[PDB]
Amino acid sequence: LGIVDIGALTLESGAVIDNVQIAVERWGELSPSRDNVVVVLHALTGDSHVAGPPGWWDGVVGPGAAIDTRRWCAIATNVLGGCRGSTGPGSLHPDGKAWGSRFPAVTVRDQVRADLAALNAMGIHQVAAVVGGSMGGARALEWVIGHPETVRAGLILAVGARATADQIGTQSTQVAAIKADPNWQNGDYYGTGLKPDVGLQIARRFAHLTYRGEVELDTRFGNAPQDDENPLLGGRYAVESYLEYQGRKLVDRFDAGTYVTLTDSLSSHDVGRGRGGVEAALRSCEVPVVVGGFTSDRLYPLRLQEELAELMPGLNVVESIYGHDGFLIETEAVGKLIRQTLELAS
Amino acid sequence: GELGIVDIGALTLESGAVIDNVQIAVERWGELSPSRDNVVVVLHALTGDSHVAGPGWWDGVVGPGAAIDTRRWCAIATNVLGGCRGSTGPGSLHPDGKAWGSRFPAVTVRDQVRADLAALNAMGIHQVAAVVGGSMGGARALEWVIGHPETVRAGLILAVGARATADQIGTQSTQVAAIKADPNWQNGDYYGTGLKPDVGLQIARRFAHLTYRGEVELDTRFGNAPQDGRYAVESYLEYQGRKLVDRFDAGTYVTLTDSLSSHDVGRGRGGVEAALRSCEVPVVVGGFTSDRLYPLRLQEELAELMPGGLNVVESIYGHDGFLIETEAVGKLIRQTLELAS
Ligand SMILES: [Ca+2]
Ligand SMILES: [Ca+2]
Ligand SMILES: [Ca+2]
Ligand SMILES: [Ca+2]
Ligand code: NA
Ligand code: NA
């Protein structure tokens, strides 16, 4: 885990963040010409820990993996706004306190420019490929549309061209649940000894449902009770105790302020903004791209990836029971799409 | 057009708990026939009540000339056991003078059916022509036809499944958790304290409303547009939450959401397949193509397993299609009433 200083960054809004730092992790050696970089773009609650025994995409990064680190140099940042090394709301403001409520709104476009600045500070100027799903797919899409000169190919998984009403609906309500927590303290809870654990748990429980496949959830849990508990006497259902576990697991590893900042960056995703709309922006693409979507995805439904593949100058439909999380679980299917993307960059 | 309160006395619930003096609120439209053979029971959904027709929550299908033509039929609607608009529920007074609150027992759909039947029986009604309902009302209709077939001549079951699913229990239990996390919940004993869990109930309803709508139509209506700083869809959801808080009780929301989570027509009957195959009542089953909460596969299962084809309603409105698609629902009601005649 290294930290790259990129200095002051001017955001799309005109706001400036002083002294931005971007955390970077690398697997594989950089080639003499620096022509073998594959940028792996993490999703909402991910980070730079892509691979290693555990890395959120370990199945696709390593020796002999889809991103074969004997040949490619896999680089992952922690996104701008994150909480695992990069500048975010918990980072220190110039006044010595956490940014907190003063942290500006960040867009996916800002996040791409911060990643590119980190690469440039490392002496890397063109990457072979960008790859990502979900928020990482939004980052990959904005990279190929906004900075095609810097990337030879892209894999865009499980995302749409802009945020949808249903996505903004659940995202805004997840944020509202966090802000309703008595410990949110307007986002300035850092250093107080209190954190909005309850609101973040509620947000994550609803988010987890959006990530899963409806049928698979019912196959896994049905209406089964939690073992030895009777719901009519105050007991819980199996899916209910599982959701409680998911919410608590996130609270134990993730910052509420970062969740809000990054969720907001999902809600403002729109490749068409300032470019004449989604269709005009997608038609402008000059980077070879592979697009994949998952049949059971309820958060970024397949129609969104059909649109990407139709408007960008065929869609890879992955039959999967795992919903949106298919982009993390379907190692072999995703691996084939990665290998196809890397062939386009070679 | 007056709200009547029917005393049904003591009710022993499926859990074994007993409520000493249950009251069920009732509204009626249309004259009861001399033989009492023209009763159509309308079963409301989670946040509905007995006010079906004025407007009422299903006003388009009840009235003179409507799908339930009150010139011929006597439409009767109760407020469900656990409710907050006249029937016994957590905000009702316990024998000790305080609200039931945290002492209110768990209520199942089967309990709700038995309370409705007891209210009808107290009014001298012993067999109904039809039961009709969608969503929680469809669960009530299904348990009525399976558990008490001798009391009903036909049923319309809309936008529900044979048991609660994992996704339904997931969102239901998390909506309840959001209410219970509100500082004003006070263990459910907030009645009379001057404080209510308005924020938690708003959060629950915002998430629930998304489950009731169609993904595509939400994007058609709002996209990522701003409001007039909120996004348009965000302002819409905030409005939906405030609207519910203004008219509905959090404790009842919890009690009735729990009743949805415990829905299972197979319990104590050998499982869903055995229970549905036992149906002796002609039923019409309807589902809506864009429903994200009770997806169409659940109604396919109902139709496949019940002795009785599925009526598939092409609708953009999601689960709320059962409330919005007046013409398609009306056709299904009229089919049901022909089976009862
Ligand atoms: Ca690996
Ligand atoms: Ca419970
Ligand atoms: Ca009417
Ligand atoms: Ca906002
Ligand atoms: Na700089
Ligand atoms: Na009685």
Q: Could you give the angle at the alpha carbon of A210 between the alpha carbons of B239 and A229, nearest 5°?
A: 100
Collapsing DSSP to helix, strand or coil, A19 comes out as: strand
Determine, for residues B14 and A232 on separate chains, whether the beta-carbon distance falls below 8 Å: yes
- CA-wise closest residue to B182 among B204, B206, B211, B209: B204
Q: Which two tokens stand for residue B122?
A: 């107290």
- CA-wise closest residue to B45 among B277, B244, B272, B310: B244
If DSSP states are collapsed to H, E and C, what string results for A70-99?
Answer: CCCEEEEECCCCCCCCCCCCCCECCCCCEC
CA A216 – CA B57 distance, rounded (Å): 34
Contact by Cβ (8 Å): A25, A49:
yes
The strand pair at A151-157 and A61-62 is best described as: unpaired
The residue behind tokens 């056991």 is: B81
From chain A, the residues in CB contact with B219 under 8 A are 164-166
Residue A223 contacts B where some CB pair is shorter than 8 Å: yes
Tell me: domain B1-341, CATH 3.90.1720.10, correct?
A: no
Q: What's phi and psi for A337, nearest 5 deg?
A: -70, -35
For residue B6, which ligand has an atom nearest its CA? Answer: 6
**Burial per residue of A118-148, b for 16 or more beta-carbon CB atoms within 10 angstroms, e otherwise:** bbeebebeebbbbbbbbbbbbbbbbbbbbbe
H-only helix segments in A108-193: 108-121, 135-146, 165-179
DSSP structure string for B207-255: HHHHHHS-HHHHHHHHTTPBP---BHHHHHHHHHHHHHHTT--HHHHHH
- CA-wise closest residue to A98 among A266, A261, A265, A264: A261
Q: What's phi and psi for A179, nearest 5 deg?
A: -65, -20
Residue A276 contacts B where some CB pair is shorter than 8 Å: no
Greatest Cα pair distance in chain A: 67
Q: Rounded to whole angstroms, what are the CA distances from B193 to A222, B90, B199, B244, B251? A: 39, 15, 16, 20, 14
CA B104 – CA B189 distance, rounded (Å): 10
Query: What is the 8-class DSSP label of residue A59?
Result: G
Experimental method: X-ray
Q: Rounded to whole angstroms, what are the CA distances from B103 to A104, A133, A235, B20, B62? A: 47, 48, 16, 13, 37
CA B50 – CA B44 distance, rounded (Å): 7
Q: How far is the CA of A263 from the centre of ligand 4 (A)?
A: 9
CA B26 – CA A67 distance, rounded (Å): 67
Q: Which two tokens stand for residue A236?
A: 């819980």
Contact by Cβ (8 Å): B129, B257:
no
Contact by Cβ (8 Å): B104, B90:
yes
A147 as an active site residue: the answer is no
Domain ranges in chain B? 1-341
- A1-346: what CATH class? alpha beta
The residue type of A116 is L
B319 as an active site residue: the answer is yes
The residue type of B304 is E
Residue B295 contacts A where some CB pair is shorter than 8 Å: yes
